[PDB]
Design a protein around this nucleic acid. Structure first.
Lengths: 219, 55, 91, 98
RNA sequence: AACACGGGAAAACUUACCAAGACCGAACAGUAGAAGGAAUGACAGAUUAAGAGUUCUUUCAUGAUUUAUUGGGUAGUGGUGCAUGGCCGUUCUUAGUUGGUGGAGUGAUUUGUCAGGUUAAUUCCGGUAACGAACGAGACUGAAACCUAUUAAUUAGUUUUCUGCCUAUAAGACAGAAAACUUCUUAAAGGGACACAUUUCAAAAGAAAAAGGAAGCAUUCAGCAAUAACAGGUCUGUGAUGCCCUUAGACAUCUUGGGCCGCACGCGCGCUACAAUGGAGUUACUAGAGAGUACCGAGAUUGAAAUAGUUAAGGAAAACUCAAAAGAACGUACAUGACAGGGAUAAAUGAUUGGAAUUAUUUGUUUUGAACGAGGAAUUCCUUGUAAUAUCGAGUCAUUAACUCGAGAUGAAUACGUCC
C-alpha cells in the first residue's frame, strides 16, 4: 500500500475543447517539439529527417519525411508508433495516423546528413575523411554551401575542433533565416563525446532571393 | 509499512511539485502560456515551438 | 520489486494487448491507467529490456517500451496465452 | 454562419481569408468582409546564459497571433460541405454554427 | 568579464548542510529455501517525534511478486568545466579575415588587403604586380515616424432615427434599441526620401546651411552579426557525457525538526528621507502596454472603522474583468520650529495563505517618534521625448518586492568638441 494521491495525467493541451488563443498555438508548437524529438530517438537509424502536424479540421495527420523507408513490413513499425501516441498523448484511435514520405533531395537534408557522420565516426573512419565523403554529397545536391564542425577529443585528451567549409555561405543577416538548414548531433565514444554540427546553405529553390542582387537582363 | 511512509509529504502548492517537461529542473520554470518548460530548455526549442528573436 | 500479485498480470496483458506502453519518470504520482504508483511500473519493466523483451527509449522524462521478438516468447510462458494469440504486427 | 481563423502566419490566414470569400460565389451569393482583430504578440524574455556567469544579457522572443472573422448567411447543411479544404499546418478553422 | 548573479523574493518540497529514524530505487543470471509455505502487511500493549508492525509478547490476511547469496549493472544537486558536447560571456561593437592565379624572396613570409581624399565602416574616388573573388560592414528583419487615396467594420468609433426624462432660451444632456457610413480605431496591400533639388566647400567620392516634407545623423531604437582564440562560467538544467569516488549501517530513497534569516565588524546593488519647488485634509482627472478556466482573472448586492467575510453575474476574452499618480484645483490650516519633515525600533491587539506563521509570511487600528540639517578621498550613468522624477503590468507567486523585464505620465541644463 502506498500513500500516494497525486496522479500526473497522460494527455496534451492540443486536445482540450476550451482553451485560449494564446495557449492553443503555444501548445501546438509544444506538442511538435516533444513529438519531433521523440521519433528522432527512434527513427535515427531510419533517418527521420522531419515531421509535420497537418490537420484537416478534425483528424490529425502525422507526416514523417524519412530518408529511408525500407523498414517502413505492412507498417508494423508504423503501427507500433501509433500505439505509443495513444498511451502517451491520449489520442483517439480513429483520429490519428502516420504517413511517411521519401525525400528526393537526400543530400539537401542536414538532419539526415549529420547522421552519416555520426554513424561513420563510431565505425572508426577518420574524421578528416568521413566528413570529406559526406561533404561531397551535399555540394552536388544543389546546395550553395555548407559547414561541418567537429569538436571534442578527436586527436588526444586535449580538446580539439576542426571546421570544414565549402562553397558560398552568408554568415550574418536575416536572410540566413530563410536559407539555413542546420542540425546538431553528438556521438558517444570510448573516450568521451564528439559534437557534430552540420548546416547547409540552400539555393533559390526554397523560394526567396538573397538580399543584394541586381541581375540586369539584356536586350 | 516499508513504503507507506514513502513520499507521504503533500506537495500540492509547488516548488517541488512542478518540474520541467524534459529537463526536469525545479528552478527557472516558465509557467507562462502553460509552457511548463524551465529555462535553458525553452531556449533550445524556442524556434522549434514558434518563437523567433524579432524586435 | 514487490508488486501487487494481481497487478503483475494486469500490466502484462495491457502491454501484450497493445504492444506499447508509456510511463512517467516521476516517482510521486500514480499511473492514471493502472491506478498504481509509477515506481511499480518503472521498476517492473526496466528489466524487461535486460531480458530483451522490449526496448528502453526514454524521452522527456517518459520511458517507452515496445514489444520485441523475444518479448512475445517471454510474455507467453508467464501469461499462459495460446500460441495462436498473436498481435500479428497490429497490437 | 461565422468563420473564425487564427494562425501564427499572417499570409496563411490571409490567403485562406480570400479563399472562403471567393468560394462564396458558388453555393451562395455573398460573404461579409474580413474583420481584422488586433494581433496578440506573445513576448517571452529569458537570460541567454545557462548559469549566472557572464554579463546580464537577454533575448526577446515573440510570437504573433492574427485573428480574422468572416460572416455569411447560406444554409447550415451546405455552408461549405467538407469544410476541410486540406488546410495548411499551423492554421486553425472554427465555425460558429447559427 | 564575481558581489537584487545561478532567472536563488529558501517555513515544509526545492535542499545540495546538520540531529535522528528508517529505507532499496540490489534489475538479470546460478544456488539454497519454498504453493506440504520464499516472503509480505497488520489491530492491541511496550519502544519510537510519529497512526514507519523499525522492533518486541501476539496471532490475523495474501502468496512466488523473490528472502540469503557471487558476477553485475545500478543510482548519486558526489569530484574533475585542467577530460568533453551544447550554450553564454570575453578579446570586440571596431572594421576586420582569407585562397585561386600571377609578381618578390632559398625560406619563414609577402603583394593584392595601398600615396592622397572621404565615409559611421579596407565605404568608396583614386593609385596600382596585381587581377578576379569569398565572409564581415552595408545590404537584410522588428517597432516608430505619414496615407481626408484603396480594402474591409465587430467585440472600435461617428452620425441619424424612435421612446422616456431633465435643464435651458434656446444648445442639447442622459437612459433603452435601431440602422447608415469609416476622419479617428484596428490590420492588409501598395505608395512614400534616393540626399535628388539649390548655394557654398572639397577632373571625384563626398561635407555644411536653408527650403519643402509625417519623416533628412545609416531617419531613430533594436535583431542578426566575420577569422582566430580563453585551457573564462556551466558535468548543481538536461535520460549529453568519459574517468575517479560512495554503492544495503550508502554520498542512492523517504519522514520529522533545524539552517541557508544566524552578528564584533568590512564591501557591492538599491528603496526612503533630510522638506515650504513640501507634508497633511478634501475635489476633478487624463494613459500606455500586459494576464485570465471546470476552477483562473473576478464584476454587482451587503455588513465592518480597515485588513478581510457571506452569496455570487458575465468572461477562454478589441466582448468581461483591470483600476493612474507626479502634477492641478479647493482652506483667514501648517510657518523655518529634527515641527505636523523621517517612519526605524518596539507594545498591545484583527484577519487572510498555508498541514504548520515560533526566529514576527503579508497586512489592518492605536500608541511608541531613533539616526538623518544635502553628505571626505574616491567613483558611476547619461546627448532628446534622452536624463531625471513619480507610477502601472508581467516573471517569480498557496501567501510574499525595496528585484528584473517591459509600459506609458511630465520633460532639464550642457557639446556639436579633443585625445588631456
Amino acid at each position: 500500500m502506498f500513500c500516494l494521491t497525486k496522479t500526473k495525467a497522460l494527455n496534451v493541451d492540443v486536445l482540450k475543447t476550451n482553451i485560449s488563443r494564446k495557449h492553443k498555438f503555444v501548445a501546438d508548437g509544444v506538442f511538435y517539439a516533444e513529438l519531433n524529438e521523440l521519433l528522432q530517438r527512434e527513427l535515427s537509424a531510419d533517418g527521420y529527417s522531419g515531421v509535420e502536424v497537418r490537420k484537416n479540421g478534425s483528424k490529425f495527420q502525422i507526416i514523417i519525411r524519412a530518408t529511408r523507408t525500407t523498414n517502413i513490413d505492412k507498417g508494423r513499425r508504423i503501427h507500433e508508433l501509433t500505439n505509443l501516441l495513444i498511451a502517451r498523448f491520449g489520442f483517439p484511435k480513429d483520429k490519428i495516423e502516420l504517413y511517411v514520405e521519401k525525400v528526393l533531395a537526400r543530400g539537401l537534408c542536414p538532419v539526415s546528413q549529420a547522421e552519416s557522420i555520426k554513424y561513420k565516426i563510431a565505425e572508426g573512419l577518420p574524421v578528416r575523411r568521413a566528413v570529406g565523403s559526406v561533404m561531397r554529397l551535399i555540394m552536388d545536391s544543389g546546395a550553395k554551401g555548407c559547414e561541418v564542425s567537429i569538436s571534442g577529443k578527436l586527436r588526444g585528451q586535449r580538446a580539439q575542433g576542426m571546421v570544414f567549409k565549402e562553397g558560398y555561405m552568408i554568415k550574418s543577416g536575416n536572410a540566413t533565416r530563410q536559407f539555413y538548414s542546420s542540425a546538431v548531433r553528438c556521438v558517444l565514444l570510448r573516450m568521451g563525446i564528439i559534437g557534430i554540427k552540420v548546416t547547409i546553405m540552400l539555393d533559390t529553390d526554397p523560394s526567396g532571393k538573397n538580399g543584394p542582387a541586381a541581375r540586369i537582363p539584356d536586350v | 509499512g516499508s513504503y507507506s511512509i514513502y513520499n507521504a509529504h503533500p506537495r500540492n502548492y509547488g516548488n517541488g511539485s512542478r518540474t520541467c517537461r524534459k529537463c526536469g529542473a525545479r528552478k527557472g520554470l516558465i509557467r507562462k502560456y502553460g509552457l511548463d518548460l524551465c529555462r535553458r530548455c525553452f531556449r533550445e526549442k524556442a524556434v522549434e515551438i514558434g518563437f523567433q528573436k524579432l524586435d | 520489486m514487490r508488486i501487487a500479485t494481481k497487478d503483475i498480470i494486469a500490466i502484462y496483458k495491457q502491454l501484450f494487448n497493445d504492444g506499447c506502453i508509456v510511463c512517467h519518470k516521476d516517482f510521486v504520482c500514480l499511473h492514471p491507467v493502472f491506478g498504481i504508483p509509477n515506481l511499480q511500473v518503472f521498476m517492473l519493466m526496466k528489466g524487461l529490456a535486460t531480458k530483451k523483451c522490449v526496448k528502453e527509449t526514454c524521452n522527456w522524462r517518459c520511458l517507452y517500451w515496445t514489444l520485441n521478438d523475444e518479448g512475445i516468447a517471454y510474455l507467453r510462458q508467464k501469461l499462459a496465452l495460446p500460441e495462436d494469440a498473436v498481435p500479428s504486427t497490429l497490437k | 454562419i461565422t468563420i473564425t481563423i487564427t494562425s501564427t502566419k499572417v499570409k496563411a490566414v490571409e490567403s485562406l481569408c480570400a479563399e472562403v470569400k471567393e468560394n462564396g460565389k458558388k453555393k451562395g451569393v455573398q460573404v461579409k468582409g474580413p474583420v481584422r482583430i488586433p494581433t496578440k504578440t506573445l513576448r517571452i524574455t529569458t537570460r541567454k546564459t545557462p548559469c549566472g556567469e557572464g554579463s546580464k544579457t537577454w533575448d526577446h522572443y515573440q510570437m504573433r497571433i492574427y485573428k480574422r472573422v468572416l460572416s455569411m448567411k447560406t444554409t447550415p447543411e451546405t455552408v461549405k460541405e467538407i469544410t476541410s479544404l486540406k488546410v495548411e499546418p499551423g492554421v486553425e478553422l472554427e465555425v460558429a454554427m447559427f
